[PDB]
Amino acid sequence: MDSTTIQQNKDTLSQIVVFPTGNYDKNEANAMVNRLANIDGKYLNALKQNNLKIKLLSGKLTDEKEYAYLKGVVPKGWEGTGKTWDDVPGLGGSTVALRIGFSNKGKGHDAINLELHATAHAIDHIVLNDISKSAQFKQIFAKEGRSLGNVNFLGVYPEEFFAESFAYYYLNQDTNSKLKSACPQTYSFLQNLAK
């Protein structure tokens, strides 16, 4: 991705990312936007067209009005973790909400990157009309959905395999190469999706 294209994506994200009120880690918030800027501009422009907001948060997700109804609720796939949405650092789908500083694997989650996994859910649901539950992807998911680990989450929910695979594809060259070797059909699928 040329510098001008990365800049173009950062400009597009400037219209999508919402920063919190009050004090927060501005450098880390910018670092999260920079990682999101590696997503194909086709998806980012569609997010902007749909007025999808990527909300960066200073506190828990359930402190936000729109997610208060999730207080005490155990998310899909989080059975046995002993936590509820109150403790979850990222949310994706019809909206996107992310806790600043929790990007890396092991910060209350086990994704390769918090913001790319969550935003992949929004792209899947809003931009691509739930392609992760299409018959085509379900066939790919049936074969390769257990090759990225966390088989009791990624290997069970096609939308989660899609989101994590999407994050692998776009985080950096290392993860992009790891996905190609582990899930070649998924890699080719995402490669064709961006054309």
Binding site: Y67, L70, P75, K76, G77, W78, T81, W85, V88, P89, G90, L91, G92, G93, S94, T95, G108, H109, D110, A111, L114, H117, A118, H121, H125, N150, F153, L154, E159, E160, A163, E164
Partner: peptide, 7 residues
């Protein structure tokens, strides 16, 4: 639609 981060 809501989906959580990977546990």
């Amino acid at each position: 639609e809501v989906n959580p981060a990977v546990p």
